[PDB]
Symmetry: D3
Subunit: 251 residues, 6 copies
């Protein structure tokens, strides 16, 4: 029993029902090596797939690529193969002055600035995490000693105009997104990323458990470049946190 993109069978997952889903294929092996008995399964396109064992239970680690479309394929195919719980770990840009580089954010809902979420539920439907996953992520993040923020994330199909960046080839932002960063800031939105609206909407409308946790790598209100050591520490802590959140989800 096979899937179109991921290159793995149900047997290859050794009964896993929980997946950790980073964006970058190069992070998959790093996450898997935090657990026991990491095994490389497949790599094709942006999809690198490992298995490992956590407290004796099989866990998948599968990259998604950037954006909702590639994410939606990985989630669907993993679900076909028995996965029911999806933990997303990644990086994010904060838009609130109070949020520091190196803090962690657990998304409580996403602003749906994507398209793929609409392929699962109409816009009125909330891009919300599973409560148990969000609770596990907050606990794992806080137990690590990180400063943790719970709140709304703006989830964009673009890095550039949808995050209201003007330092671009055209220097233009379409009307819809002009003044948008200030609006989200005034509404209390914490951060930008590019996958949570699709992931959370698709899972919450499909009987799958999902959540998102991210390390803050930049703050759009601070012009200074963050410290290399702080970025290193943040990346390392983010993947230790998601594995501890996975531990808390196991039954």
């Amino acid at each position: 029993k096979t899937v179109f993109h991921l290159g793995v069978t149900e047997a290859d997952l050794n009964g896993a029902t929980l997946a950790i889903i980073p964006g970058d294929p190069a992070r998959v092996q790093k996450i898997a090596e935090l657990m026991d008995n990491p095994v490389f399964l497949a790599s094709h396109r942006e999809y690198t797939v490992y298995r490992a064992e956590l407290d004796g239970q099989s866990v998948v680690v599968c990259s998604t690529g950037i954006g909702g479309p590639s994410t939606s394929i990985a989630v669907e195919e993993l679900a076909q193969l028995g996965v029911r719980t999806f933990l997303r770990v990644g990086t994010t840009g904060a838009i609130q002055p109070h949020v520091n580089v190196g803090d962690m954010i657990v998304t409580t809902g996403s602003v749906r600035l994507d398209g793929a979420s609409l392929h699962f539920a109409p816009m009125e439907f909330p891009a919300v995490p599973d409560f148990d996953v969000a609770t596990a992520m907050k606990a794992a993040a806080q137990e690590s000693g990180a400063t943790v923020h719970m709140g709304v994330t703006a989830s964009s199909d673009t890095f550039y105009p949808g995050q209201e960046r003007y330092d671009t080839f055209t220097g233009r932002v379409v009307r819809r997104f002009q003044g948008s960063m200030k609006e989200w800031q005034d509404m209390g939105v914490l951060n930008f990323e590019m996958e949570s609206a699709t992931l959370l909407t698709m899972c919450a409308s499909s009987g799958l458990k999902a959540g998102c946790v991210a390390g803050v790598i930049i703050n759009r209100t601070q012009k200074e470049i963050p410290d290399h050591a702080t970025l290193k520490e943040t990346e390392a802590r983010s993947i230790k946190v998601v594995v501890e959140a996975a531990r808390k989800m196991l039954k």
Copy 2:
């Protein structure tokens, strides 16, 4: 000093920063009498306002009326007078067969089938509660001995067509809402009500903490009529739960 509709002053609230907001004016005194030193403040239109004390802290109880528009006035005016945390307690119709009459539901996100939410944030923005409020409501519900569900609520500007009821004067439902109850059922939505989309969107986009907990009074999938005793116990338990959730928020 004063507000347009609620007929109270900041001084009347004796420093309260938390409000319990039922819909029915007649339930305000019932909630207030579970706390210490309940005092009637005002009644105008659908807005009945009491003050009380919980663990030595002032707490407001204010009715909202039915629907997002009247709710939005109460929340705004209370926020002008210093309230920052809003706990909604109410009744709901379940639409999932596994949810029984007498169970409780804590909303993790709302389907925005309202209008007033759009006066605070565009449709993309998620109608989600404050995570600490949702956590406190879950804990208080569980500690009451209730069966508790966390999940998505469909929040409608109408009782009739927007809940896909056909036993009406015209017997017609507009195209938008034809087949909608089955759509939400298949997407895992737990229940219908008429205020959470407005409340959660307004508060999440305005720096206010909000959540919603409800007792299930009917299940749209079950022919059995619930008896008077189970209904009476459900309304009593709901208001005990919301006051214990308030205690957890003030702690």
Copy 3:
């Protein structure tokens, strides 16, 4: 055959096919006492219901609460009990400099800034009164000696941001409503209220006759504060006008 919310039966209405529907429950007895043989029927939540006799014919008076959602329940349940004609009487904020406190407005169409209207007809459908009701209301208003304006009303699900009020807790108005009062003023819109779009859409799309008349209590463009006397005269004239408009509708 006792309706869900209003607490009355078809028999209670003694054959009435016309209702006067103010917003405030406290105004119901005042309007009923302008007619013969006023009788209190029920009070639950924002719904106070009286019956009276006008030229020997039974007339209902029923409050709606603030907003389309609570209005839509009252209209539906009255229609279930045989009511076919709905006369709304209310207060309003004028937005045109030529409209004075104490004038009366008869709505010829509403700007649909609500949500509940969409639960009856798609946005393309006009929120239009019944021509006979509008004609009766104009005649009653003019015969009273009032200065009467016929025109478009902006009908908002909120009192605050949807009427472009900035004197609020956050002082923020969402993009959709920023600059909206000037836009409506430049398009000749007379006034703001919160129910007519729902009422007129639901009735025009359901085989029910409806209209709206209002006394002006404030003008958003005038700095002067109206005196207590003028406002009292205005409230009194508004309810005398709606009863005379009811007399003109009786067959």
Copy 4:
């Protein structure tokens, strides 16, 4: 002199007119104008034929619009530039209610905005409604002609074919948006279809101009029977008598 882009007339040509009658068909302009005093041809360009005439001593314009909101919006704007403030549309319509007969008249109280041009003047939320004095005058003139008159909502479509849910077409298909739409409008009490009122009424109600629409019923989508030639000819004559009498009510 004051000129306009499309209509080919000047403000002076209108001799002080503040009221226009606006049929769709250029060939109907002279027919309306000859019911008044001193009709004079002013100009014809594209679908816009323009006459002046006099009604109870006051100047009146008669100007065709062509089919559809876009061409109508040009005529209204340019007439407004030249001092016209009141616009009375007369036309033909298909009824969709079984109780409305061929030969009846409909005065529109509001339009379903199934157009595009209305959105160039006001967002969809804004009501496509007539000026109350114009509708009142139209109703009175229609009743006084002996016609059976209906007041109600009109569905105003940018197409004759799919937007009126016609299937007897080249493709036989109707886009999803319009599938089931005639039954929907029928159940909502809509009286009739036409192609200009949403644009006209929205444009005018949002621009300080007084507008209304009155129409003779030429077909009923629910009746298999073919109307006879006589009934149709009588209907077209009575419609233009009615709109001129409505104009008379508006001028005094």
Copy 5:
């Protein structure tokens, strides 16, 4: 047989499967006289219809009137009578400084600022010409010696606010269209007209081949007033170009 508006039969078209569709009824005879054996068929409302012969093959010439609605009727009815290819020739306002009066524009796609296109395909569908038509129009326009621009056209249901003209009776443009001309300019749109979105969408979605070619009669960005000779030469070249494009389409 016959059709509702155009006043012609299939036999009247003597086998024609290609139509040239100008807007102005007065231009029909001019275009037909560029071909052999022009014959007047009918005139009703804005629809003047002629048939002619091009390289021995029958060609229809039929005016559309201004706007998508009247265009949509002509196209439908011609299609009922066997026409499959539609060549629009017209005038246009350039909005780019590099486009001169006398140049020719062949539309490669239209901005759908119309309503009638939506009656054939949802907004996501592209208002795109048939590739063979566009190729033929490019070749004919270049062979004439004109300077030819291939690109996007903004297709508006109005001449005034939808082209962001302020020199109007009210001097107002609705919010949707404020700043729109600069937006289209920055997006590289070449010109405005009023029919292409409807024509291209209806044909591309209905199995019919369509394209648009236009002579530039004015440039919104240039101060120079085109002289009488250049405008007369441009109108003349435009119709010679469309007939040569028709020649290229004949099989």
Copy 6:
């Protein structure tokens, strides 16, 4: 110098390239680059593998995009920052018309915008259409290869599954918006589904960049026949031959 956020290359690395070939799959980048002169690996990060090569003496970039508009939009933007002005997409597609066979090629003339990223560049009304020179070059190159070539509209979806109306899925459900959609596109003459052209074409047409899309048909949603290995291998080889010849036509 300056190095962009994601692609890990500098302007100098591109040796003056103003044209990029942008496949989806990183593994296809070297395969395209080796059909040209002096291919050199530049960088690999995430789904972005970047080579340079020379075609008729001129520098050409080859850069993978990943699946979907979002990751595509990043690659196009960053290449444009580094001087690229022309973008040629080559990929695979599922045909939805019975007349289109596995092994045919499709050149998109316009895309149905069933994506989200296109809206971050232009509102929905704006057409997702290719540069006419690119589409012309792609047609010519495809015909010259011996392929059967179709010009027409492509449905461009943010999903592989529900947005292409697939029911053989974990839930077996398709959201209301997409129920019936494949028949709807079929009856409107749409040729095929893919996942990037709406974003690419809208982004470039609204930003002063020239773009086009050509694809080899790997499946037909209306056919039960399973395509054989040899036909699929020949299709993939021909597609990349075609895009390089189209590039040669663009540089000429």
